[PDB]
């Protein structure tokens, strides 16, 4: 399908950056993720880790700093379904990331690391990607 | 009847604010516009005047301060077509507005007036507005 998708962001990202991700959640998906990483090394810091878990019915947001994960935040319910397509907008603003799913504001994740450290977007897990666009 | 559509921006707009306009260009459309205004009074300043012209086949960007227009910036081609539907994204960033038309970054307009004064959205002219959503 789309396999782990990687998009580089050399200049980083600033408030007013929009990540639009469209794809399908396959019939037997357990979970997938969208990470905003700070480098290409494995286990690199994550300004944001968005993780819809269909197997447990939760959507988790977290960060990873200096090798250790922070405290997990959970969104309101699971707006994703196995066998259904989706569209997610992850908008960077001054104070955090707005996560919009299916045309509705879903969760706001206050910044934990400086937006300026982000260098790569990675998408992986049980999802079949249509497209990942960054505006 | 061409009564323009008017939409309030309750918390105003800041870097990270996304305007999503969906519509369809009428068959005999001449031109249409999206205005970001600073007040509800006829003749208020326009932080942004985005005006695609099918007849002159050119898209004009411009601001209007204290009654008079300013330096007009044109964009690359006409990403709109008569009788066809379009989806436009206007993204406010720290240094300007990014206009995205159907999956592609179209033009970047640097702030002339301050984001802080913008208070409403106006869409008028030859266009069938389907919806305006602010994220
Ligand atoms: O500046 C935006 C403003 O343009 C007016 O038309 C301009 C036009 O851009 C230019 O080709 C010509 O030389 O001058 C005209 C008038 O100053 C439009 O009439 C107005 O609706 C806006 O779109």
């Amino acid at each position: 399908s789309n396999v782990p998708h990687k998009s580089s962001l050399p200049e980083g990202i600033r408030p007013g950056t929009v990540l639009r991700i469209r794809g399908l959640v396959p019939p037997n998906a357990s979970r997938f993720h969208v990470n905003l990483l700070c480098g290409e090394e494995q286990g690199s810091d994550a300004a944001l880790h968005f993780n819809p878990r269909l197997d447990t019915s939760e959507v988790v947001f977290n960060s990873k700093e200096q090798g250790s994960w922070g405290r997990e935040e959970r969104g309101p319910g699971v707006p994703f379904q196995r066998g259904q397509p989706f569209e997610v907008l992850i908008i960077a603003s001054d104070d955090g990331f707005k996560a919009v799913v299916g045309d509705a504001q879903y969760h706001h994740f206050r910044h934990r690391l400086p937006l300026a450290r982000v260098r790569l977007v990675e998408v992986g897990g049980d999802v079949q990607l249509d497209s990942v666009r960054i505006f």
Side-chain angles (χ1 to χ4, degrees), chain A residues 61-111:
Chain A
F61 299 71
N62 208 350
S63 44
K64 183 187 215 219
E65 145 112 78
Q66 308 239 248
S68 66
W69 291 96
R71 184 173 190 88
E72 286 176 346
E73 289 184 26
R74 267 142 181 94
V78 203
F80 298 91
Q81 286 218 219
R82 296 162 151 132
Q84 292 302 310
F86 67 80
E87 179 187 79
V88 173
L89 287 188
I90 284 172
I91 311 150
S93 69
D94 274 330
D95 71 339
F97 293 103
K98 299 178 267 198
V100 183
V101 189
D103 261 31
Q105 165 70 17
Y106 175 75
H107 185 76
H108 179 271
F109 188 85
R110 167 98 222 153
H111 293 313

Side-chain angles (χ1 to χ4, degrees), chain A residues 15-89:
Chain A
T17 286
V18 174
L19 266 60
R20 185 175 66 210
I21 296 127
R22 294 175 174 159
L24 171 76
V25 168
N28 268 300
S30 269
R31 48 184 73 185
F32 70 97
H33 57 265
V34 178
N35 293 329
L36 299 193
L37 310 167
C38 292
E40 290 167 53
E41 70 276 9
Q42 285 161 8
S44 149
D45 284 356
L48 168 75
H49 165 78
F50 171 74
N51 179 222
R53 309 176 174 169
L54 291 311
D55 50 359
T56 62
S57 303
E58 296 198 305
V59 174
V60 171
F61 299 71
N62 208 350
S63 44
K64 183 187 215 219
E65 145 112 78
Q66 308 239 248
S68 66
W69 291 96
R71 184 173 190 88
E72 286 176 346
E73 289 184 26
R74 267 142 181 94
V78 203
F80 298 91
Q81 286 218 219
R82 296 162 151 132
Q84 292 302 310
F86 67 80
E87 179 187 79
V88 173
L89 287 188

